[PDB]
Amino acid sequence: AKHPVPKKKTSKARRDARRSHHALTPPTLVPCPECKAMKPPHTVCPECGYYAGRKVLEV
Amino acid sequence: MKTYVPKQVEPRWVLIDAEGKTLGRLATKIATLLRGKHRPDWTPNVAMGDFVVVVNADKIRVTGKKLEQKIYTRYSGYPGGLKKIPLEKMLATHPERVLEHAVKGMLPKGPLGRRLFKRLKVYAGPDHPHQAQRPEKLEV
């Protein structure tokens, strides 16, 4: 193995090019049917503690 | 006084019966029609030439033993990927390619040359679909 190394500095253009896929997608979030607050779906609502209609958590 | 440049012009559709014409020598003419170089207002940096429709390509003609000996060649990028297809066979399978490939080679390379090629509409057999354009018949 012989220690590969970059032959040329990578341009400002070419790094940013690579970075075209680095963008985050914002959290996917739904309204909680009980307290109308926004939350990940399929999670127990951390604002009111309800899930599937019932209380599941003290919060 | 600065040289004249055309504003956008509406391109003429011209039609040509290839039948029995000497392949290559028909080919040079089509190119000049294509580039626009028959027009006094010819400008090298824009698509201002004709649209050429050719018909009866199957019935192109050719001198010497070229039918049996002229070999069109395709390279695949793979080992052992040179394809050699002789003119006889070419006409026998995609006759319109023969004039096409001739003309292509005599237009410029580059983006514009590639666009000019797109304006060449070549057909086997007497008939062609561009009735809509009412192409003007040319004897060349």
């Binding site: 680095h22 985050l24 914002p26 959290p27 979030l29 939350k39 990940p40 | -």
Partner: protein, 112 residues
């Protein structure tokens, strides 16, 4: 009428935080707030604070109304980097740049 806030010398790397800042540029204060809460990144915690300190400023100092607030512009510039030595093998020592961010949020009012 705009109102802004800046966290200076926040000791997280600019490249890393910009990602989060990016997610909420041009959003209702409300959406931004939602987005950050459920964004999985240390930077979410900081942008949060600037966003919030900013809105506080908007209402309280600048006569803007919370329900009209949106992220007008926001950005992370880099500050003075913290250099630390990382020991490598064979007697060598590299140098790590524990980098540093100046996060800015600027809120405007969305008319209507």
């Amino acid at each position: 009428m705009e109102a802004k806030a800046i966290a200076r010398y926040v000791r997280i790397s600019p490249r890393k935080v910009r990602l989060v800042v990016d997610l909420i540029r041009g959003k209702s204060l409300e959406e931004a707030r939602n987005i950050l809460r459920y964004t999985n990144k240390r930077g979410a915690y900081f942008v949060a604070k600037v966003l919030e300190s900013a809105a506080a400023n908007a209402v309280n100092n600048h006569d803007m109304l919370e329900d009209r607030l949106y992220v007008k512009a926001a950005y992370v510039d880099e500050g003075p980097a913290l250099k630390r030595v990382l020991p490598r093998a064979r007697g060598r020592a590299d140098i790590i740049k524990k980098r540093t961010s100046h996060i800015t949020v600027i809120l405007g009012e969305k008319h209507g």
